[PDB]
Ligand binder design. Sequence first.
Ligand SMILES: */C=C(/F)C(=O)Nc1cccc(C)c1Nc1ncc(OCc2c(Cl)c(OC)cc(OC)c2Cl)cn1
Length: 299
Amino acid sequence: DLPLDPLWEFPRDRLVLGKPLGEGAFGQVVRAEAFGMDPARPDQASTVAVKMLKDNASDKDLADLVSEMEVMKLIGRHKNIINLLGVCTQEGPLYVIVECAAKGNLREFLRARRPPGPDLSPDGPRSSEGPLSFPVLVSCAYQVARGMQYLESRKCIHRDLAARNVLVTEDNVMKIADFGLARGVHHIDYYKKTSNGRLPVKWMAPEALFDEVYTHQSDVWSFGILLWEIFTLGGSPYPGIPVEELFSLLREGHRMDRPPHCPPELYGLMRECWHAAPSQRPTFKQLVEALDKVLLAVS
Ligand SMILES: */C=C(/F)C(=O)Nc1cccc(C)c1Nc1ncc(OCc2c(Cl)c(OC)cc(OC)c2Cl)cn1
């Protein structure tokens, strides 16, 4: 019953569905092979991610997916976001086809690449050199800021910006994920813990958590938390603090400590991002420039 949009429509028979990547309120995601995503090379294979509805989805579920699809159409393409590739709306189930990042999300990317602990026996000339270096960590932060700046310019507020919502390509390019999700901000279970132990309330700006107010400056707060995640190499924010305690600590103006092996320049940016007044936090344009200066000084 959905209208045809020839600009984005992709023949569903050119998809070969593969391994499920995840399922939830937002639909289910399946890895797939696509043939001829580039119309110039009709028989060329590529690996993509496909969002679709679940089993006994309701009419609301379909509306939510159609909405996310249209939002992704509207926002357009950028290097540092997960981009819309095509859609399947005709003669069959609704598919939304997007880019698939090979290396997973940034949190797991970092946690899997923490430096060798002294418990490992030295072997060869690089025994203490881990996969992650400071300039690459800074580059990760810079790329996310660039993506958010783009999303900002298209009037998009993410509302959950976190390392888990940043994906990493085969070339270590950062791509912001799920930026067009309806997130039900008027019915958030602040005590909710995910299957992997995440407490999403720990990324919310105070004005969002306490006043249900979101601006781009709310995302800047979240970016500050994400900065902290990066330079703890995928650590969980507010260590050992449960949600009830988080509430009172935030009301008292509590902020996270400077992490180990983190230069003052970057903790400085974190603390700026967590300034109480939204207007006293940097803009994403300012964050891009600030991080670019560090990047150029160390590259
Ligand atoms: C396809 C390979 F790269 C792959 O299997 N990648 C992979 C493997 C494990 C874990 C992750 C996170 C992962 N990457 C990955 N990349 C993209 C992706 O797409 C999800 C998705 C969808 Cl379906 C939509 O549809 C609207 C929007 C969106 O955003 C925007 C994202 Cl991120 C899932 N996983």
